[PDB]
Write a protein that binds this DNA or RNA. Structure first.
Lengths: 55, 55, 55, 55
DNA sequence: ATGATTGACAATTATTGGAAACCTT
DNA sequence: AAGGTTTCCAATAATTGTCAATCAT
């Protein structure tokens, strides 16, 4: 009902943050690594995956 | 080709720092608000209209 | 500045500036090598010679 | 001073230089601009050109 | 109130610029 | 010699991690 998903300001240090209300209510998304899907002009971030290219 | 993308490492406590490569390549100013839509376990990060900015 | 056919400034003493992303794209370290060749009147920059599997 | 196809070592830097023979043949300024373009995994640098980002 | 989340600041590392040394006509 | 080129070092700054303050139930 709050600002769980829609838009948020990016930090001046170049960091995007997850809405407080979202993470504070449902920790259904961990933080450490994520999959970057560059869909033309939109960056879709999915759950972390191995995808190891080299040791 | 399958459901996979670029493996990005962010902060283990949060701070979703999008790829530095794309940041400078596309020229994404990190001083405004970016759209963040939650889709199950993935989040769509984009601008109001990134397909009509440098175009 | 990506290599999408974009020009960039050289240097007061003449030095080809390699952008962060470009350096990372080539996969070269601060202990690598670059083969400088020429085609007609253009500079052909070739990455380091692996000659070994990624291990 | 032909250095056509010379392997330049990359030390603790990030950017490199262009061989004297190539530099002289280029016929450009010291602080000129080189058109950076890619080729699979190699790079093709042409002479100055009015090519700007998003323009 | 207290533990967890987020934003701010600081430290580290990468890159670009400049100065110095060596080479060549 | 001296002008040119290249290599090394220093400075700048962008980025990521740490963590301390605050708020929600």
């Amino acid at each position: 009902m709050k600002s769980t998903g829609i838009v948020r300001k990016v930090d001046e240090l170049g960091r995007v943050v997850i809405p407080i209300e979202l993470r504070r209510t449902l920790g259904i998304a961990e933080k450490d690594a994520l999959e970057i899907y560059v869909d033309d002009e939109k960056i879709i971030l999915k759950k972390y995956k191995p995808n190891m290219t080299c040791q």
